[PDB]
Design a protein around this ligand. Structure first.
Ligand SMILES: O=P(O)(O)OC[C@H]1O[C@H](O)[C@H](O)[C@@H](O)[C@@H]1O
Length: 548
């Protein structure tokens, strides 16, 4: 069952010479730079208002061209077109993978089961546009005749993370509407969210692709019950909308068909904010800004699709991460956005990347014996510098990172941006080159320490450097540039998926937790000593019954 080609990466001629080049070459950033005054010019891409500098990576020309060779030898070009043109590359679920079509604005006709999809895509977009104008303008009144003031999106993972992150990121572009985000099945979540809300002016969005997810549906029914303390059941259709592929199950909720915002099974959850799932974003910043978001993604789309690999930003991002993950044995990749607007960006890439490539079986049905998806993590700068950058600078862990920044602040205050930016430049410079023993002894003598102090202290103040980083400079955080930046990583994950020879678009690994939880749920509701599992699950459960 093959669509995408199934070339095992550890078998290519490129992987061989990469294994050989790594084995016989020290990659010392300070060296690579001292040897070559043009290193930055050679190892960066300046696409219009965007600088992607990959020169602080642990690569020389040879490793660089060999990693390009590997993507070519894994037939990456073939894979790109299979995705964009709608081949059923999600083979285990027999699905196409067409989040790119969600933002192509009808410039391409993609056919799925003999059906052009762009009519469908633009219909829902225009549907989100007309709906949202009526909420924002205040033409769409709640049941007592008041304007909606508050929008509560309800969903989990793919139905939560993207709307959260984007709305958080584009807070400068906000409408009048307040947005709120219920996700956890923990009832304290919706309880705290609605606590100061008014059901006369609150609009609920039930985002669930399947519309069967336990967390979402429980939150939906709590939102309904909460709403029904003030409203009538015939009023549900005025305050509840749904974003799903499951129009039948939605309609049973009391949500009107007209307010079902459809998307499709070739839109993965973690790639869905571009679709109907983006509606909370539509209401949060208006549709014009949402189109600007989809346009930024399409520009990355076009760039990834047509640009030769040496100049292809997501391809470089992808092959560089394979380098660190499989050759430098690095288990993690840090995501360090120097902007408080990107406070939920690392969290979003956690699902997009790790749920996509957290696999250990190849497209052939075979267990892999090489590492696949890494651990994605981070916090914004400069905040991270005061949490975990100590470990990056001086721990035992090799942690490659992406440092993401903007030349311009949407809110420019005194010297804030230049100070922010001064850290952005310094931390990748410090991570790359460190500070040597002689550099340390010099600062210590100048500090007036006696040789005994100097002796004891030198190693604790040394930085061996040699942490690799990518640096992104966009000009300004807008919907467009955010659309670019998200789609860069989307295509990073695709690239790495193609090379690693896995399926980036299924998620069979969630099923066992779901099943075991369905067995335990009724067990917690009765009053019996539970003995049906292992001794730990038995103990945890019975302890909970005595203290619930
Ligand atoms: O959108 P839903 O159908 O409610 O699914 C929400 C999430 O749950 C799934 O089990 C997976 O964890 C994600 O791929 C998905 O985004």
């Amino acid at each position: 069952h093959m669509s995408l080609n199934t070339i095992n990466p550890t078998e290519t001629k490129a992987w061989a010479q990469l294994k050989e080049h790594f084995a016989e070459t020290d990659f010392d950033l300070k060296q690579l730079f001292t040897e070559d005054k043009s290193r930055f010019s050679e190892f960066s891409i300046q696409k219009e208002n965007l600088l992607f500098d990959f020169s602080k990576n642990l690569v020389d020309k040879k490793a660089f061209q060999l990693l390009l060779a590997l993507a070519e030898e894994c037939h990456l070009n073939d894979a790109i077109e299979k995705m964009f043109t709608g081949d059923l590359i999600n083979q285990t679920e027999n699905r196409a993978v067409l989040h790119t079509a969600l933002r192509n604005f009808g410039e391409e006709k993609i056919v799925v089961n003999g059906k052009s999809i762009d009519e469908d895509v633009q219909r829902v977009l225009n549907q989100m546009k007309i709906f949202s104008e009526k909420i924002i303008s205040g033409e769409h009144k709640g049941f007592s005749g008041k304007e909606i003031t508050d929008v509560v999106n309800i969903g989990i993972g793919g139905s939560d993370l993207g709307p959260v992150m984007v709305c958080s990121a584009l807070k400068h572009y906000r409408t009048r509407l307040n947005t709120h985000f219920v996700s956890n099945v923990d009832g304290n979540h919706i309880a705290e969210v609605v606590k100061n809300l008014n059901p006369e002016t609150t609009l609920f969005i039930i985002a669930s692709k399947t519309f069967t997810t336990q967390e979402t549906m429980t939150n939906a029914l709590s939102a309904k019950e909460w709403f029904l303390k003030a409203g009538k059941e015939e009023d549900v259709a005025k305050h509840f909308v749904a974003l799903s592929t499951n129009i039948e199950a939605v309609k049973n909720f009391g949500i009107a068909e007209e307010n079902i915002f459809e998307f499709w099974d070739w839109v993965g959850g973690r790639y869905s904010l571009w679709s109907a799932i983006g509606l909370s974003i539509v209401l949060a910043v208006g549709y014009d800004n949402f189109e600007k978001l989809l346009r930024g993604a399409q520009d990355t789309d076009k760039h990834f699709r047509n640009t030769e690999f040496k100049n292809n930003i997501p391809v470089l991002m992808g092959v560089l991460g394979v380098w660190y993950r499989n050759f430098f044995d690095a288990s993690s990749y840090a995501i360090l956005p120097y902007s408080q607007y990107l406070d939920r960006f690392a969290a979003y890439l956690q699902q997009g990347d790790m749920e996509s490539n957290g696999k250990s079986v190849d497209r052939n049905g075979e267990f892999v014996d090489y590492e696949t998806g890494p651990i994605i993590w981070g916090e914004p700068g400069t905040n991270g510098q005061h949490a975990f950058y100590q470990l990056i600078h001086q721990g035992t862990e090799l942690i490659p990172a992406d440092f993401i920044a903007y030349a311009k602040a949407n809110n420019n205050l005194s010297d804030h941006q230049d100070k922010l930016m001064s850290n952005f430049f310094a931390q990748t410079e410090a991570l790359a080159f460190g500070k040597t023993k002689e550099q340390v002894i010099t600062e210590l003598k100048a500090s007036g320490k006696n040789e005994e102090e100097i002796a004891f202290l030198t190693n604790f103040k040394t930085f061996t450097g040699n942490t690799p980083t990518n640096s992104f400079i966009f000009e300004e955080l807008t919907p467009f540039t955010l659309g670019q930046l998200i789609a860069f990583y989307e295509h990073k994950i695709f690239v790495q998926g193609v090379i690693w020879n896995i399926f980036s678009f299924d998620q069979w690994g969630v099923e066992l937790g779901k099943a075991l939880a369905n067995k335990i749920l009724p067990e917690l509701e009765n009053t019996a000593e539970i003995t049906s599992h292992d001794s730990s699950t038995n103990g945890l459960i019975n302890f909970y019954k005595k203290h619930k």
